[PDB]
Amino acid sequence: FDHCFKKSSDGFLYCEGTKVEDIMESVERRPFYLYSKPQITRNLEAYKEALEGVSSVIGYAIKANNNLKILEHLRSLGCGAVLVSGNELRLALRAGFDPTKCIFNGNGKSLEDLVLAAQEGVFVNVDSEFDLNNIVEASRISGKQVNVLLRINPDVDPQVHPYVATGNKNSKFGIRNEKLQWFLDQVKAHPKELKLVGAHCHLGSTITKVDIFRDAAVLMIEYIDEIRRQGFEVSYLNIGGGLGIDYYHAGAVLPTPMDLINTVRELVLSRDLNLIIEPGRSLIANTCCFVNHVTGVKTNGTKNFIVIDGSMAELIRPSLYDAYQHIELVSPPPAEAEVTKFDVVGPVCESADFLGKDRELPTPPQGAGLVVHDAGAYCMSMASTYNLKMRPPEYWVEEDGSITKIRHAETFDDHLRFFEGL
Amino acid sequence: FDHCFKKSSDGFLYCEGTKVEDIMESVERRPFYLYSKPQITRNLEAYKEALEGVSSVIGYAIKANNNLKILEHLRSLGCGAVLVSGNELRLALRAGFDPTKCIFNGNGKSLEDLVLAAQEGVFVNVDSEFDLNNIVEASRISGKQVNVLLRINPDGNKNSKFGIRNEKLQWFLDQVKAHPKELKLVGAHCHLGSTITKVDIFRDAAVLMIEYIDEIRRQGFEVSYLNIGGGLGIDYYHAGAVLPTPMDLINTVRELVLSRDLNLIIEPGRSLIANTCCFVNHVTGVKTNGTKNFIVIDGSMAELIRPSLYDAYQHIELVSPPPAEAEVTKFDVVGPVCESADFLGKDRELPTPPQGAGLVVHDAGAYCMSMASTYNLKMRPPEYWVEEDGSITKIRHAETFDDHLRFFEGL
Numbered sequence: 113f114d115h116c117f118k119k120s121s122d123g124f125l126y127c128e129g130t131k132v133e134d135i136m137e138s139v140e141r142r143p144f145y146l147y148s149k150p151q152i153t154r155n156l157e158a159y160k161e162a163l164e165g166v167s168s169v170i171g172y173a174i175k176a177n178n179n180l181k182i183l184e185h186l187r188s189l190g191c192g193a194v195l196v197s198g199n200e201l202r203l204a205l206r207a208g209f210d211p212t213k214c215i216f217n218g219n220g221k222s223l224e225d226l227v228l229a230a231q232e233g234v235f236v237n238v239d240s241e242f243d244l245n246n247i248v249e250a251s252r253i254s255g256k257q258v259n260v261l262l263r264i265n266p267d268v269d270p271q272v273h274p275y276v277a278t279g280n281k282n283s284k285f286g287i288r289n290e291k292l293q294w295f296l297d298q299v300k301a302h303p304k305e306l307k308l309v310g311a312h313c314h315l316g317s318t319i320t321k322v323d324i325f326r327d328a329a330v331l332m333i334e335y336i337d338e339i340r341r342q343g344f345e346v347s348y349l350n351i352g353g354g355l356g357i358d359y360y361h362a363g364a365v366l367p368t369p370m371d372l373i374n375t376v377r378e379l380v381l382s383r384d385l386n387l388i389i390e391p392g393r394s395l396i397a398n399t400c401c402f403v404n405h406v407t408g409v410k411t412n413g414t415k416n417f418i419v420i421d422g423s424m425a426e427l428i429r430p431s432l433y434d435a436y437q438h439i440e441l442v443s444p445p446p447a448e449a450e451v452t453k454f455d456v457v458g459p460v461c462e463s464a465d466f467l468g469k470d471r472e473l474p475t476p477p478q479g480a481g482l483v484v485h486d487a488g489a490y491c492m493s494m495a496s497t498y499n500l501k502m503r504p505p506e507y508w509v510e511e512d513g514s515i516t517k518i519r520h521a522e523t524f525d526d527h528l529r530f531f532e533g534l
Numbered sequence: 535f536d537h538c539f540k541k542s543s544d545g546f547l548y549c550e551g552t553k554v555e556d557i558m559e560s561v562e563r564r565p566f567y568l569y570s571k572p573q574i575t576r577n578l579e580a581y582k583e584a585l586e587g588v589s590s591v592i593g594y595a596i597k598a599n600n601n602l603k604i605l606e607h608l609r610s611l612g613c614g615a616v617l618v619s620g621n622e623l624r625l626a627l628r629a630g631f632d633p634t635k636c637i638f639n640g641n642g643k644s645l646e647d648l649v650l651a652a653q654e655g656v657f658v659n660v661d662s663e664f665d666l667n668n669i670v671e672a673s674r675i676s677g678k679q680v681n682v683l684l685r686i687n688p689d690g691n692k693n694s695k696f697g698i699r700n701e702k703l704q705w706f707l708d709q710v711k712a713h714p715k716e717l718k719l720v721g722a723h724c725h726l727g728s729t730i731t732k733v734d735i736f737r738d739a740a741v742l743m744i745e746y747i748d749e750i751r752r753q754g755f756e757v758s759y760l761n762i763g764g765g766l767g768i769d770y771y772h773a774g775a776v777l778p779t780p781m782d783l784i785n786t787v788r789e790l791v792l793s794r795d796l797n798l799i800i801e802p803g804r805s806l807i808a809n810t811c812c813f814v815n816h817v818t819g820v821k822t823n824g825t826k827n828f829i830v831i832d833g834s835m836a837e838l839i840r841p842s843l844y845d846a847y848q849h850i851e852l853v854s855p856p857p858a859e860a861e862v863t864k865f866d867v868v869g870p871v872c873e874s875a876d877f878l879g880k881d882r883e884l885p886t887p888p889q890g891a892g893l894v895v896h897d898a899g900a901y902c903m904s905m906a907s908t909y910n911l912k913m914r915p916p917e918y919w920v921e922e923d924g925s926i927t928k929i930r931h932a933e934t935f936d937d938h939l940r941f942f943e944g945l
């Protein structure tokens with residue numbers, strides 16, 4: 113289905129009509145993240161078409177991917193920005209995002225970062241009692257009123273939605289609906305510092321069934337009804353992020369952005385609410401491969417290993433979450449290459465350094481290209497310099513099949529800078 | 535026990551006689567890694583005394599912690615260096631390590647990195663067939679013969695990506711015989727795992743490694759080194775557990791090594807650097823989710839991923855005496871990062887801290903800073919150490935937002 117990375121019957125992987133092998137030969141022989149700029153455009157356009165007729169902000173979650181060129185591109189197409197730190201807000205402003213389409217969320221927002229948010233006029237979510245006290249303090253410091261959204265855990269039916277219900281009892285995020293009156297009384301006490309403009313929920317990540325959005329929005333509209341009846345002017349419902357994509361490339365049918373917005377469309381329109389959505393994964397994940405070269409193939413007797421140049425330093429998701437990302441070769445394998453089971457592992461000093469397990473692949477020769485698919489979200493953004501494996505360069509392919517560098521490779525000199533003069 | 539971070543009866547945390555609260559007030563209000571320079575010295579001295587009477591190399595595993603000042607200090611006390619990448623080799627040479635006491639290990643060493651290793655004349659392990667073919671090629675490119683150790687898995691191993699197949703031993707020997715100009719086989723290498731709490735396994739491994747070395751010598755190879763790897767564990771729970779000492783570890787192999795006139799290489803990381811360090815934090819706030827309590831700190835999985843990645847316990851306590859009548863209750867200690875995996879510890883019995891109070895994560899010297907990311911653009915922390923005289927020196931600059939922006943200059 114319609115993936116921007118396609119294996120044609122010639123046995124070559126393509127991005128936007130360009131062979132990945134040709135792209136690999138044109139850049140340095142080290143691991144790198146490869147994006148389709150058009151697939152970024154297609155992902156954004158699917159949300160824009162889904163929200164047509166609804167007053168809305170598409171809040172791209174920068175925590176997914178903080179490439180400045182990708183952010184400037186999304187901004188150029190009418191995107192807002194969702195931030196979880198002051199530095200993310202500085203990068204959004206540098207990328208040219210409108211502060212009236214920026215939302216600063218978080219369970220531990222620093223007073224420093226809240227002063228920046230108040231100064232720049234962005235939307236700020238309220239996560240806790242200490243959080244609201246810091247936002248009032250940031251208002252007093254900046255001398256600006258802050259536009260706030262209360263982050264509420266919707267009391268979803270635990271027999272229908274056990275994982276979300278339990279998540280609300282165990283998680284560090286959000287306000288229990290039982291404490292709502294405390295927050296409203298506090299807002300009413302600080303009219304100069306606080307303007308309550310809406311309510312916020314965020315329901316999880318990799319959501320593959322949209323019934324949770326339907327059921328949560330019904331509960332969020334009843335909270336907004338109650339808030340409006342107490343005389344607060346509420347104009348936004350932020351339903352958060354979390355729409356999933358297909359990681360398995362096995363034909364699974366996932367809900368679209370249209371399906372997601374169709375669950376809240378009529379209630380939002382009936383209440384004259386602006387809808388904020390906060391997608392990260394569903395905007396950037398499926399636009400990107402982590403591109404590798406095969407170091408070599410080995411066996412310990414039971415398991416076979418394809419050893420690559422890339423590692424848990426660049427891409428930790430499989431190790432950290434036991435997550436599946438799809439793996440395939442870039443080029444036709446030798447005639448006579450045996451298809452069998454491989455763990456795909458990096459050169460890093462521990463057994464947690466794997467990119468995938470139990471994958472049926474043609475035995476690749478040394479130097480063959482290999483990709484980890486759907487590597488656009490929470491991959492580069494979570495990269496380390498473990499084993500002094502310096503962070504990779506990034507490229508993208510444009511509509512004409514031309515290749516542009518969108519991030520410099522990190523160098524060893526960038527490690528040494530930290531000790532300069534010490 | 536004998537820990538460099540001590541909680542006085544007065545309710546203050548101390549490092550080498552200096553109050554941690556005093557150190558926090560003297561640096562920027564952001565998370566930082568704080569080390570006892572003296573404790574680094576003690577950890578090394580314990581290995582140095584355990585190895586007296588044995589020809590040996592203490593190969594500090596740089597993957598544990600790559601602070602350049604910590605590397606220089608270990609080098610100044612006679613340490614060797616264990617490396618898993620060319621960049622680690624570059625950093626070790628910059629730290630002034632003797633290439634004769636450097637060991638380059640790995641299951642995916644790059645031809646590039648093997649060329650540098652051959653040029654600099656460091657020991658290089660042999661992990662697989664493809665690896666041996668790469669060392670041979672690196673020898674031809676550099677025109678230097680390579681001193682090699684075969685990495686054996688002495689009988690999490692039917693699953694390991696590391697080491698040769700024991701049953702293919704003869705294949706490796708025949709290949710070394712067949713490349714005299716390129717290869718000199720100098721020894722054998724095993725690494726048994728990490729957080730090892732029972733030195734029995736070292737004893738059993740050494741006996742099997744010595745059978746191998748005897749066979750390799752009988753076939754005419756001049757082998758001088760047994761590299762028994764690292765993996766000695768430390769106490770993370772701080773509740774009186776008694777772990778094998780380095781003296782205990784060397785005592786199980788000492789007579790065997792002497793009887794064969796072998797040079798012993800050990801490759802400690804965790805047991806040189808872990809217990810010297812606290813990850814030092816400020817409390818942003820305390821929140822409740824009904825009966826469930828959270829201490830929210832400025833630190834996170836961006837700086838310290840081990841609890842989340844390995845479900846590892848690291849001890850947590852407050853820096854300063856709490857207010858009288860502060861409820862002692864159960865807390866998760868969590869950062870500001872936008873996901874559930876961002877915790878430093880779960881279900882910890884602590885006095886309710888006020889906003890801005892200091893909180894430490896213990897035994898954070900190993901696989902903590904070295905695995906740090908810029909997730910959520912939480913830029914990496916500065917590092918400080920305490921001297922013998924109780925003064926504080928910066929040993930690493932804090933990363934800045936400019937350090938992100940530099941990746942896009944001219945693009």
Ligand SMILES: Cc1ncc(COP(=O)(O)O)c(C[NH2+]CCCC[C@H](N)C(=O)O)c1O
Binds near residue numbers: 194354872
């Ligand atoms: C409050 C809030 N809003 C939006 C998002 C974006 O979610 P998504 O990218 O659309 O799913 C989030 C994100 N929450 C945590 C996501 C962690 C993902 C994890 N690193 C991974 O799977 O790699 C949010 O908190």
Ligand SMILES: Cc1ncc(COP(=O)(O)O)c(C[NH2+]CCCC[C@H](N)C(=O)O)c1O
Binds near residue numbers: 725900
């Ligand atoms: C070949 C080899 N030699 C030495 C070591 C050092 O081990 P230790 O630090 O003495 O236990 C290793 C280490 N290997 C993997 C360590 C992973 C630890 C993990 N990141 C963690 O616990 O945080 C080695 O491979």
